Design a binder for this molecule. Structure first.
Ligand SMILES: Cc1nc2ccc(Cl)cc2c(-c2ccccc2)c1C(=O)O
Length: 134
């Protein structure tokens, strides 16, 4: 079906802006913010039929989620939140909403030129993380 063809691949983080404030807003403690903020993850995105898998490999944590668009799932985040996640495709953007403890954060993943841009939003705080092909 070629859904998400442009996202598929191996991507390496090259820049991050305002991620400390994002993590604070989400509730991440001091030490975890410091160590997570250093990391330069490899994000590996693959598709097999209707199932999308996004793996993140880094010095901090390795994470993996597999999901079907529109179908809620359980996720344990890198900072150990136990969240309920739903990922949809809206106008070519992967939109990932995480719900936990009456809170919500949204992570958007977009293809821009040869980059994959990740925008993380919690209340009024945004962080932008830019990935290039690995
Ligand atoms: C989207 C996201 N949200 C987070 C929230 C809190 C903390 Cl501490 C970490 C993350 C991370 C992350 C950062 C560094 C290495 C590995 C994961 C990511 C991610 O880039 O995949």
């Amino acid at each position: 079906s070629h859904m998400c063809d442009a996202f598929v691949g191996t991507w390496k983080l090259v820049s991050s802006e305002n991620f400390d404030d994002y993590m604070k807003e989400v509730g991440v403690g001091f030490a975890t913010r410091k160590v997570a903020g250093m990391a330069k993850p490899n994000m590996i995105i693959s598709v097999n039929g209707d199932v999308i898998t996004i793996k993140s490999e880094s010095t901090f944590k390795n994470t993996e989620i597999s999901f079907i668009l529109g179908q809620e799932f359980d996720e344990v985040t890198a900072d150990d939140r136990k969240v309920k996640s739903t990922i949809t495709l809206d106008g070519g953007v992967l939109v990932h909403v995480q719900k936990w403890d009456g809170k919500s954060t949204t992570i958007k993943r977009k293809r821009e030129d040869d980059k994959l841009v990740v925008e993380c939003v919690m209340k009024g705080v945004t962080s932008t993380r830019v990935y290039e092909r690995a």
